[PDB]
Every structure is written in C-alpha cells, then in structure tokens.
Amino acid sequence: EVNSFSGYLKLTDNVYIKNADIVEEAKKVKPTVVVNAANVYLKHGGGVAGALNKATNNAMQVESDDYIATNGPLKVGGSCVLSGHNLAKHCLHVVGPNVNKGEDIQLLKSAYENFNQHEVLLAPLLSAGIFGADPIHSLRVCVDTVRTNVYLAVFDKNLYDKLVSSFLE
C-alpha cells in the first residue's frame, strides 16, 4: 500500500513526526515523495543525503550528477524533483541553508515552501544536524509553512522528545 505511515504522532492537521531513520521509513512506507536534505551540487557525501544515496546503491548520485551537468546547481532554498529509485516514486532534493557555512536562516522558509508542490511527503528536519540551524526553530518553520501532508522522520530519540515537548508547550 502507498503512503503506509505507522507510529507517527500527529502535531497539526498536516504535520506528523516519528523517531525513525528516514531510510528505514522510505523502505517500510513506500512514499510517493521522499525529501533529501541536499546541497546545491547534489553531492550526497554524508548524513541524510549520503544515507539515502547508499540505500539506492549510488544510483541517486549518478542521476544527480547528470541533472547538474545539464541544469547547473540549485540555489539555497530551492529544489528539484528526480527519481525516488527503490525508496519512493520521486525524490524532492531540497537545499536548506547551512548556517555553519554562513547561509541565511531566513531561507529555511523558502526551503520548506518547496514541500507545498507535493500532496504527501516523507521528510527530514531541514537544516538540522551539521547544517547548524536550531532544530526547534526548524520544526516551527515547517509547521507554519507546509500546508500539504508531511511526515517527519527524526533519527534521534533525545531530539524527538525535545521537539514534541517544545510543540506541546
């Protein structure tokens, strides 16, 4: 069955969250769209992007290199739609700002706005981890910005608990 999400906590009518690895979720759920936390040259060298590319046995990286050759790099806050390979029908590669590299946190609203072109998505928490944004702020921007149905997979129980406690204040 498509979009078989299980064990999520509903935060708002359109935002759900789970303590889970996005790779394992994409295999279990078979979503229409999985979001990748990409960079502008689609080089999936580590973290969430590296994990999703490894799960496709590098097919995502080869396809990404061909897209960049023809179209050039993405902009920070932008996105592109490529194949989902074995993980989803489509992968939406979204570039959140990397605050640790000097990029503007205000671009996180533009990043989440890309999700609104898809009815349902499995996604990570944009610009969190080594991109350096405050993860509680990223969840607030997601809730305020995304209007379609988004299922967030956050692979850390400590962070999951802090995010749910923050939302429910």
Ligand X SMILES: CC(C)[C@H](Nc1ncnc2[nH]c(Br)cc12)c1ccc2c(c1)S(=O)(=O)CCC2
- 14 within 8 A of 149, measured Cβ to Cβ: yes
Does 21 bind ligand X (CB under 6 A)? Our answer is yes
Does 91 bind ligand X (CB under 6 A)? Our answer is no
CA atoms 64, 71, 107, 150: torsion sign:
negative
Does 23 bind ligand X (CB under 6 A)? Our answer is yes
**Burial grade of 64 (CB within 10 A; 0-12, 13-18, 19 or more):** buried
Contact with ligand X (CB under 6 A): which of 77, 84, 97, 129? 129
Nearer to ligand X, 70 or 76 (CB): 76
Nearer to ligand X, 82 or 139 (CB): 139
Q: Going by DSSP bridges, is the β-strand pair 33-37/79-83 parallel, antiparallel, or unpaired?
A: unpaired
- Name residues whose C-beta falls within 8 Å of residue 46's C-beta, 6 or more positions apart in sequence: none
Mark 32-71 with x for binding to ligand X (rule: CB under 6 A) and - for no binding.
Answer: -----x---------xx--x--------------------
Residues near ligand X (CB under 6 A): 21-23, 37, 47-48, 51, 124-125, 127-131, 153-156, 159
